């Protein structure tokens, strides 16, 4: 959908009306206009179509919500992602990534090729399930009805994402299994909170169940079980398929630039060796961060942000009324030749390696990996570190190349940019099994 919008943005500019019959979208590719919609005048907008897409699974979760219900739930959930909790989650990122490395090691020894997209999906599902509501999917190793239920739901969400866009049964069961499973976790976590002796503060975290579900229950907001299930469900959907795509496209991009891989291997060998990364390593893995930054620029998740005007406004210098469906093309902002040198080149050092990490503010909204304004992603640090940990640990241990005769790598976008047929790679060990673990300082 958004691929033709790139050339149309080159011809017709930062804001234009895509009409298809009697319906139309406003297509925004101007960083100034994006900043006006996302941050300066955000009160004039709702999530619009986005809610119609995600409502069946996310209910009253943060992403599709607006108004006071959004404001109250945002204020309750954001404290759960404090620095100590993010620091603890980094251990989880290292454990789960290590379980993936073990699979790649097994395949490497047998000369087997690996389809990385499906594995990255299993890895990021295993991470998000433990981090949010203390569930161990173990989708890296096994398949369960719970796991199959999640993917059924994700397939339906992708269908609802493509449905309102012009081109030029088992769901209800999967929802019931996920919701009942959440109920059991909520129940189990309630007993644990009733029995503990911990005092609640701004950095509250039970070291045995550091999940977001546990923080919320120990805070005592006392909302409905549906509202809590939907908040957890929303974060489960948000934190999963986004990073799965980020890792997939990162490693694809690494196949296209062997000089970046040498630079990345050099950093990871020197900074972490065989270690599980820690919070202190997140600042030290500069080039790894830039590689993630540049991957999210080349392949944003999602490529498009969705709003609907609920009041009069001026976009660029065109007046609009309420009721306009707006699609901010993050893809166009990220690749705009106006605002990027060699915009199609994979170049992690396009931001100075020792300068500030890029965000929507210092890039003046030409770069929105996590959005902007009041609706900005609350998991931006969570996911930023999750992906740095995965990249570093994988690159330390293996060399990846496009597999011979692998299917082509094409984009199939619903809510995230998936590939058409996977990312088939040959994986080769960089360290020998009989080598003593290398711990650098």
Ligand X SMILES: CC1=C(/C=C/C(C)=C/C=C/C(C)=C/C=O)C(C)(C)CCC1
Cα–Cα distance, 151 to 243 (Å, whole number): 15
The Cα-based distances of 390 to 115, 369, 386, 406 in angstroms read 16, 18, 6, 23
383 scored as a contact of ligand HEM (CB under 6 A): yes
Cβ nearer to ligand HEM, comparing 216 with 238? 238
Beta pairing partners, 306: 327
301 scored as a contact of ligand HEM (CB under 6 A): yes
48 scored as a contact of ligand HEM (CB under 6 A): no
Shortest distance in whole angstroms from residue 334 CB to ligand HEM:
12
Cα–Cα distance, 348 to 290 (Å, whole number): 5
Are 378 and 62 within 8 A, CB to CB? yes
Show contacts with ligand HEM in window 221-240 (CB under 6 A): 234-235, 238-239
Candidates 388, 354, 380, 355; CA nearest to 272 is 388
H or E stretch at 235: helix 225-255
Cβ nearer to ligand X, comparing 47 with 275? 47
366 scored as a contact of ligand HEM (CB under 6 A): no
Are 322 and 310 within 8 A, CB to CB? yes
Cβ nearer to ligand X, comparing 150 with 427? 150
Cα–Cα distance, 154 to 145 (Å, whole number): 14
62 scored as a contact of ligand HEM (CB under 6 A): yes
Q: Tell me which of ligand X, ligand HEM, none is bound by residue 2, counting a contact when its beta carbon lies within the kind-specific cut-off of 5 to 8 angstroms.
A: ligand X
377 has binding-site annotation = yes
Beta pairing partners, 411: 419
Shortest distance in whole angstroms from residue 435 CB to ligand HEM:
32
Binding mask 64-83 for ligand HEM (x = CB under 6 A): ----------x---------
371 scored as a contact of ligand HEM (CB under 6 A): yes
CA 171 to the chain's CA centroid = 23
Q: 231-258 burial string, b = 16+ CB within 10 Å, else e? A: bbbbbbbbbbbbbbbbbbbbbbbbbebe
Show contacts with ligand HEM in window 138-177 (CB under 6 A): none
3-state DSSP assignment of residue 315: strand
Shortest distance in whole angstroms from residue 295 CB to ligand HEM:
9
Shortest distance in whole angstroms from residue 376 CB to ligand X:
10
Cα–Cα distance, 230 to 56 (Å, whole number): 10
Shortest distance in whole angstroms from residue 34 CB to ligand HEM:
11
367 scored as a contact of ligand HEM (CB under 6 A): no
Give 224's Cβ-side CA count (13 Å radius): 7
Cβ nearer to ligand X, comparing 51 with 147? 51
Give 245's Cβ-side CA count (13 Å radius): 26
Cβ nearer to ligand X, comparing 287 with 365? 365
Binding mask 94-113 for ligand HEM (x = CB under 6 A): --------------------
| Contacting residues toward ligand X, per CB under 6 A | 1-2, 50, 53-54, 63, 161, 165, 237-238, 242, 301-302, 304, 413, 415-416
* Contacting residue, 8, 63, 88, 146, with ligand HEM by CB under 6 A: 63
Cβ nearer to ligand X, comparing 181 with 329? 329
* Contacting residue, 36, 229, 375, 397, with ligand HEM by CB under 6 A: 375
Whether the ω angle into residue 11 lies within 30 degrees of 0, i.e. cis, is: no
Six-digit token pair at 40? 């300066």
90 scored as a contact of ligand HEM (CB under 6 A): no
| CB-based closest residue to ligand X | 1
Cα–Cα distance, 103 to 229 (Å, whole number): 32
93 scored as a contact of ligand HEM (CB under 6 A): no
Are 365 and 72 within 8 A, CB to CB? no
* Contacting residue, 377, 391, 394, 403, with ligand HEM by CB under 6 A: 377
- Beta carbons within 8 Å of 228's beta carbon, 6+ residues apart: 186, 213, 216
Cα–Cα distance, 50 to 307 (Å, whole number): 7
User: Quick count: other Cβ atoms within 10 Å of Cβ 72?
Assistant: 14
Q: Tell me which of ligand HEM, ligand X, none is bound by residue 237, counting a contact when its beta carbon lies within the kind-specific cut-off of 5 to 8 angstroms.
A: ligand X
Longest alpha-carbon distance in the chain: 68
Cα–Cα distance, 227 to 206 (Å, whole number): 23
Write down the residue that tokens 């299930």 correspond to: 229
Shortest distance in whole angstroms from residue 307 CB to ligand HEM:
7
Cβ nearer to ligand HEM, comparing 385 with 403? 385
Q: Tell me which of ligand HEM, ligand X, none is bound by residue 304, counting a contact when its beta carbon lies within the kind-specific cut-off of 5 to 8 angstroms.
A: ligand X
Binding site as annotated, residues for heme: 377
Binding site as annotated, residues: 377
Residues that bind ligand HEM (CB under 6 A): 62-63, 74, 234-235, 238-239, 242-243, 246, 301, 305, 369-371, 375, 377-379, 382-383
């Amino acid at each position: 959908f958004f691929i033709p919008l790139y050339e149309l943005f080159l011809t017709y500019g930062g804001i234009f009306r895509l009409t298809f019959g009697p319906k139309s979208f406003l297509i925004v590719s101007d960083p100034s206009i994006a900043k006006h919609i996302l941050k300066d005048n955000a009160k004039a907008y709702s999530k619009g179509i986005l809610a119609e897409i995600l409502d069946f699974v996310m209910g009253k979760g943060l992403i599709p919500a607006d108004g006071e219900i959004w404001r109250r739930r945002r204020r309750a959930i954001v404290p759960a992602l404090h620095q100590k909790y993010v620091a603890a989650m980094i251990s989880l990122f290292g454990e789960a990534s290590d379980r993936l490395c073990q699979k790649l090691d097994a395949a490497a020894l047998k000369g087997e090729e690996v389809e990385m997209e499906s594995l990255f999906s299993r890895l990021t599902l295993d991470i998000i399930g433990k981090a949010v509501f203390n569930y161990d999917f173990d989708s890296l190793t096994n398949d369960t009805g719970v796991i199959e239920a999640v993917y059924t739901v994700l397939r339906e969400a992708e269908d609802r994402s493509v449905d309102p866009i012009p081109v030029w049964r088992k769901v209800a069961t999967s929802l019931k299994l996920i919701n009942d499973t959440l109920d059991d976790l909520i129940a189990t976590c309630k007993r644990m909170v009733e029995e503990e002796e911990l005092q609640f503060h701004e950095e509250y975290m039970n070291e045995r169940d550091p999940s977001i579900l546990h923080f919320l229950l120990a805070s005592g907001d006392d909302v409905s079980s549906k509202q809590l299930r939907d908040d957890l469900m929303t974060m489960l959907i948000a934190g999963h398929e986004t990073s799965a795509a980020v890792l997939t496209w990162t490693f694809y991009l690494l196949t296209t630039e062997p000089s970046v891989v040498a630079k990345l291997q050099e950093e990871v060998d020197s900074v972490i060796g065989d270690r599980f990364p820690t919070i202190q390593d997140m600042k030290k893995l500069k080039y790894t961060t830039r590689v993630m930054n540049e991957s999210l620029r080349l392949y944003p998740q999602p490529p498009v942000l969705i709003r609907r005007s609920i009041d009069n406004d001026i976009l660029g210098e065109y007046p609009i009324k309420r009721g306009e469906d707006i699609f901010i093309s993050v893809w166009n902002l990220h690749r705009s030749p106006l605002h990027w040198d060699d915009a199609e080149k994979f170049n992690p050092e396009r931001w100075p390696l020792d300068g500030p990490n890029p965000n929507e503010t210092n890039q003046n909204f030409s770069y929105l990996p996590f959005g902007g304004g009041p609706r900005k992603c609350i998991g931006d640090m969570f996911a930023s570190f999750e992906n740095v940990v995965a990249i570093a640990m994988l690159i330390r241990r293996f060399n990846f190349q496009i597999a011979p005769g692998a299917p082509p790598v094409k984009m199939t976008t619903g809510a995230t940019i998936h590939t058409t047929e996977g990312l088939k790679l040959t994986v080769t060990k960089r360290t020998k099994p009989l080598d003593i673990p290398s711990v650098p300082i």
